[PDB]
Amino acid sequence: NLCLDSLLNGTQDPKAFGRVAVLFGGKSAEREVSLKSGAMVLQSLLAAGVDAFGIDVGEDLLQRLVEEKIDRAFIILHGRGGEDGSMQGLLECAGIPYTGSGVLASALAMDKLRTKRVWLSLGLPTPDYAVLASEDDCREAAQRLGFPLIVKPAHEGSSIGMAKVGGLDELIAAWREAARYDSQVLVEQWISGPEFTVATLRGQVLPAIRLGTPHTFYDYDAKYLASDTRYQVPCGLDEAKERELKELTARACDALGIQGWGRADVMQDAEGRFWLLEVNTAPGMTDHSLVPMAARAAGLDFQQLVLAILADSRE
């Protein structure tokens, strides 16, 4: 449950966190988003008076880690190399405590196919889908699922490599484009209705946000470049519905082992049923970003939000 008080815990002493390294950048397709998220986190942590410094994660990372003294690592990398468990395992081997989900949870939630597979085995709702690896797999998926469809790489974020398709020819093309980012490509049935995102923080589910864009879907341009994107807090859901969405988010995150914080993306169809899309374990922290927005609705500014994430890493 949303308890503003217990959300802030190790928050009051920015000196007690030690020297904190903010890990951002990286070599994934979401690097540009990570840079903006890192600059935001580093600036807020510095203004809070924590012993913070930034590391653009690159080829010199292991050298950086042995040279600098580091008491805590705040992971704000996006995509593979940051959210997939690899950076988490590195920090565990380096004996450095870090923020967010563990190795297994991070690796699982990065894999949309494996995440959906876990969800289905627990009776949790997630759109029907197919795995695309050939033109024949596209013809099979188009036959069984109809149109429109949503094509996505399995290990991507920020809607990169994604496409809404209305025909088999558009589907084959969208499969070949996503395959440029990831040999694992999945296609989902298009859910028509409201889009919601649900942030979680230290085990607590934050107020849901309703999303809207004139674009065909919530794509890259709608997320970080456009200006006509609509964010509604509170979401227009009634009490019993927002509780249903919140309880569903908690079951979907718990099923993956999510820890510390995260953000769930959920669609709703014309009959009111919710459908789980993905879970992000190092969500964005830019100006356009949604976890900060749901935090403000909960009652925390951007400075208390990062300190709460940092304070959770102490267990």
Ligand X SMILES: N[C@@H]1CON=C1OP(=O)(O)O
Ligand Y SMILES: Nc1ncnc2c1ncn2[C@@H]1O[C@H](COP(=O)(O)OP(=O)(O)O)[C@@H](O)[C@H]1O
- Which amino acids are annotated as binding site for Mg(2+), given as ranges? 265, 278, 280
* Using rule CB under 6 A, residue 195 touches ligand Y: yes
280 assigned to active site? yes
Q: Write down the least CB distance from residue 170 to its own copies, Å.
A: 31
Q: Could you tell me how many residues make up the chain? A: 315
Rounded CA separation 125/266 (Å): 10
For residue 84, state whether it binds ligand X (rule: CB under 6 A). Answer: no
Question: Cα(185)–Cα(132) distance, rounded to whole angstroms?
Answer: 5
Lookup result for tokens 């709702």: 125
Q: Establish if 178 lies at the interface with ligand Y (CB under 6 A).
A: no
Q: Exposure pattern of 250-280 as b/e (b: 16+ CB <10 Å)? A: bebbebbbbbbbbbbbbbbbeeeebbbbbbb
Task: Give the C-alpha separation, 61 to 121, whole Å.
Answer: 38
Residues forming the site for Mg ion (CB under 5 A):
157, 265, 278, 280
9 is catalytic: no
Catalytic hit among 31, 72, 80, 263: 263
- Of the ranges 152-160, 232-240, 249-257, 301-309, which one interacts with ligand Y (CB under 6 A)? 152-160
Q: DSSP secondary-structure letter at 98? A: B
Binding at 284: pick from ligand X, ligand Y, its own copies, none (beta carbon under 5-8 Å per type)? ligand X
C-beta of 129: minimal distance to ligand Y in Å?
8
Part of the chain binding ligand X (CB under 6 A), chosen from 49-57, 94-102, 130-138, 276-284: 276-284
Q: Pick the binder of ligand X from 41, 284, 295, 309 (CB under 6 A).
A: 284
| Residue 116 binding result from its own copies, ligand X, Mg ion, none, given CB thresholds of 5 to 8 Å by partner type | none
Tokens of 159: 């809607």
- 231 in catalytic set: no
Tell me if 274 sits within 8 A of 210, measured CB to CB.
no
- Would you list the DSSP string of 54-75? EEEESTTHHHHHHHS--SEEEE
> Which H/E stretch holds residue 298?
helix 290-298
Of 98, 129, 220, 224, the catalytic one is 224
Percent of the chain as helix, strand, coil, to the nearest 5: 40, 20, 40
Nearest approach in angstroms of CB 199 to Mg ion is 12
Interface residue list for its own copies (CB under 8 A): 57, 59, 61-63, 65-66, 81, 84-90, 92-95, 103-104, 107-108, 111, 114, 121
Where on the chain is the footprint of ligand X (CB under 6 A)?
30, 33, 78, 157-159, 223, 265, 280, 283-284
> Catalytic positions, please?
30, 158, 224, 263, 265, 278, 280, 284
